[PDB]
Design a protein around this motif. Structure first.
Motif, PDB file in Angstrom:
ATOM      1  N   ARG A   1     -82.696 -24.512  73.099  1.00 16.43           N
ATOM      2  CA  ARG A   1     -82.950 -24.234  71.690  1.00 16.43           C
ATOM      3  C   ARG A   1     -81.936 -23.245  71.143  1.00 16.43           C
ATOM      4  O   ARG A   1     -81.552 -23.324  69.979  1.00 16.43           O
ATOM      5  CB  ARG A   1     -84.364 -23.697  71.473  1.00 16.43           C
ATOM      6  CG  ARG A   1     -85.465 -24.727  71.648  1.00 16.43           C
ATOM      7  CD  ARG A   1     -86.827 -24.062  71.603  1.00 16.43           C
ATOM      8  NE  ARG A   1     -87.001 -23.117  72.703  1.00 16.43           N
ATOM      9  CZ  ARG A   1     -88.088 -22.379  72.892  1.00 16.43           C
ATOM     10  NH1 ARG A   1     -89.108 -22.470  72.050  1.00 16.43           N
ATOM     11  NH2 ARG A   1     -88.155 -21.545  73.919  1.00 16.43           N
TER      12      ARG A   1
ATOM     13  N   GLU B   1     -78.438 -25.044  70.952  1.00 27.04           N
ATOM     14  CA  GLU B   1     -78.552 -25.996  69.857  1.00 27.04           C
ATOM     15  C   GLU B   1     -78.592 -25.260  68.527  1.00 27.04           C
ATOM     16  O   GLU B   1     -78.124 -25.774  67.514  1.00 27.04           O
ATOM     17  CB  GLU B   1     -79.797 -26.874  70.029  1.00 27.04           C
ATOM     18  CG  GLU B   1     -79.965 -27.981  68.991  1.00 27.04           C
ATOM     19  CD  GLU B   1     -80.592 -27.496  67.696  1.00 27.04           C
ATOM     20  OE1 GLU B   1     -81.302 -26.470  67.727  1.00 27.04           O
ATOM     21  OE2 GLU B   1     -80.372 -28.141  66.651  1.00 27.04           O
TER      22      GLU B   1
ATOM     23  N   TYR C   1     -75.067 -24.026  67.774  1.00 25.54           N
ATOM     24  CA  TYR C   1     -74.243 -25.212  67.584  1.00 25.54           C
ATOM     25  C   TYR C   1     -74.485 -25.811  66.208  1.00 25.54           C
ATOM     26  O   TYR C   1     -73.544 -26.100  65.466  1.00 25.54           O
ATOM     27  CB  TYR C   1     -74.539 -26.241  68.675  1.00 25.54           C
ATOM     28  CG  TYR C   1     -73.788 -27.544  68.539  1.00 25.54           C
ATOM     29  CD1 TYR C   1     -72.468 -27.657  68.954  1.00 25.54           C
ATOM     30  CD2 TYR C   1     -74.404 -28.667  68.005  1.00 25.54           C
ATOM     31  CE1 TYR C   1     -71.782 -28.850  68.837  1.00 25.54           C
ATOM     32  CE2 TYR C   1     -73.728 -29.861  67.881  1.00 25.54           C
ATOM     33  CZ  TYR C   1     -72.417 -29.949  68.299  1.00 25.54           C
ATOM     34  OH  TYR C   1     -71.740 -31.140  68.179  1.00 25.54           O
TER      35      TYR C   1
END
Lengths: 49, 49
Positions: free
Chosen positions: B3, B6, B9
């Protein structure tokens, strides 16, 4: 632990969401202002006249 | 970890997205301003007249 980690995670993704949305809102409003000032503020009133 | 990675990102891809969108908004607004000033600001009001 899972509700907590999910809570801070969702808090991060959401603050990021409102952040990026605020950014696109900013570039949108700025672009629209630059266009409307490029065109002439009273000219549109003539267009609606 | 997933998480988080991500999250950073997606934060990167999104800031890049609003960035490029801001750029296209800029070239668009600039091009439209150059055209509308090339044509004559009051002429369009005559076109709507």
């Amino acid at each position: 632990k899972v509700r907590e980690m999910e809570l801070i995670y969702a808090r991060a993704q959401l603050e990021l969401e409102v952040s990026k949305a605020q950014q696109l809102a900013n570039v949108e409003a700025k672009k629209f202002k630059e266009m409307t000032e490029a065109l002439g503020p009273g000219t549109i009133r003539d267009l609606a006249v």
